[PDB]
Write a protein that binds this ligand. Structure first.
Ligand SMILES: [Cl-]
Lengths: 45, 169
């Protein structure tokens, strides 16, 4: 899961709003699956 | 900032038939910094009492404040999520299309907003998620007025003039 800088900001933004509802974060990140974002998040936080 | 903003935003966005409008206002404590001032949501979702259709905008703002602490997030369309996530944005001097409109004093008409370079538009991925193709910002009433739509709209300054007249009523 190699997020671009824009994907990181937007994931952080979505996380600060819905928490770990990875379905809702992924809907805002084109091309990324809910698990990709979960995978990115655990390895960063 | 200005009086009757919520209603003027509603009248103007409904008249031009775009997806949303936002008024970015300058922080009272941080000079040159823009924050979400108000907005009208005119997009898709899934009357004599509310002739301007203000309710969904109010509910989206309510939900944002709840989450930032009637609608549940699972109910929101792609464009509603765009509109709600915009409320979290703050723009430093010259940053993004709103900060650039404030700093250079001129309208910025962004086509292909879904793929705009980050130096020009800080919300391209978010726009892509909602198929938001056109975003326009212009300095107005000491802040910046932003309108956006899912359609591709060729540049037409009469759209901006229409919004401005519906404010200076
Ligand atoms: Cl921006």
């Amino acid at each position: 899961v190699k997020m671009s800088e824009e994907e990181e900001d937007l994931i952080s933004r979505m996380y600060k709003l819905v928490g770990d509802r990875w379905e809702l974060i992924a809907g805002r990140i084109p091309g990324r699956t809910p698990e990709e974002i979960e995978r990115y998040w655990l390895m960063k936080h | 900032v200005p009086d009757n903003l919520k209603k003027q935003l509603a009248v103007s966005v409904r008249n031009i038939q775009w997806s949303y409008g936002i008024f970015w206002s300058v922080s009272a404590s941080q000079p040159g910094v823009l924050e979400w001032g108000d907005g009208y949501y005119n997009g898709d979702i899934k009357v004599k009492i509310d002739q301007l259709g203000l309710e969904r905008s109010e509910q989206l703002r309510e939900l944002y404040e709840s989450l930032s602490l009637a609608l549940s997030p699972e109910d929101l369309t792609d464009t509603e999520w765009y509109y709600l996530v915009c409320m979290s944005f703050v723009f430093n001097i010259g940053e993004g299309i709103p900060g650039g409109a404030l700093s250079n004093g001129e309208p910025i008409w962004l086509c292909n907003a879904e793929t705009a370079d980050s130096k020009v538009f800080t919300r391209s991925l978010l726009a892509k998620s909602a198929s938001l193709q056109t975003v326009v910002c212009f300095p107005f009433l000491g802040g910046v007025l932003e309108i956006g739509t899912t359609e591709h709209i060729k540049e037409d300054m009469n759209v901006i003039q229409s919004v401005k007249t519906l404010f200076l009523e």
